[PDB]
Amino acid sequence: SRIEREQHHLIESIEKSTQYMAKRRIGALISVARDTGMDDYIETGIPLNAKISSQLLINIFIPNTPLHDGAVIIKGNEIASAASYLPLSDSPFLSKELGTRHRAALGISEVTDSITIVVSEETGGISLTKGGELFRDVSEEELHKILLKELVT
Ligand code: NA
Ligand code: NA
Numbered sequence: 001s002r003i004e005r006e007q008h009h010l011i012e013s014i015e016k017s018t019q020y021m022a023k024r025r026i027g028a029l030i031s032v033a034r035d036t037g038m039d040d041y042i043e044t045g046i047p048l049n050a051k052i053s054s055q056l057l058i059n060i061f062i063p064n065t066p067l068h069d070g071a072v073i074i075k076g077n078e079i080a081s082a083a084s085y086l087p088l089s090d091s092p093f094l095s096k097e098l099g100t101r102h103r104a105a106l107g108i109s110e111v112t113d114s115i116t117i118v119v120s121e122e123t124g125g126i127s128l129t130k131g132g133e134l135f136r137d138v139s140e141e142e143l144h145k146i147l148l149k150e151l152v153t
Pocket of ligand 1: 092093094
């Protein structure tokens with residue numbers, strides 16, 4: 001069916017783009033909206049309303065480019081916005097070796113049911129946040145299984 005194919009394409013697009021960016025240590029921050037509206041953070045970014053593709057995600061996060069400075073927010077079947085703000089967690093439990101992208105991913109995860117993916121520009125490690133929890137430096141298998149569980153409904 002249609003939504004099936006879209007959600008699997010979304011997963012593939014996330015997996016391909018973060019693999020590309022992780023090998024090159026390109027920082028990335030991708031938040032996927034679910035039941036909780038994120039329109040109030042979409043409004044802070046540059047509106048794209050674009051089809052989802054691994055290629056567009058990669059191009060967005062290229063450093064020192066107009067769209068890279070913040071978060072991509074995916075809503076339904078579109079890349080809604082780029083360079084968006086996400087709220088920074090105040091948690092002192094988040095390791096000090098992790099940067100602003102991780103703290104923003106943790107922050108949005110505390111106030112929405114979104115699923116947020118981080119690529120670290122320091123390590124290339126991929127992490128995910130959900131419900132105020134951080135899954136740090138996930139494997140490709142782990143990333144795949146989590147995206148399947150959380151994004152295919
Ligand atoms: Na800690
Ligand atoms: Na954890």
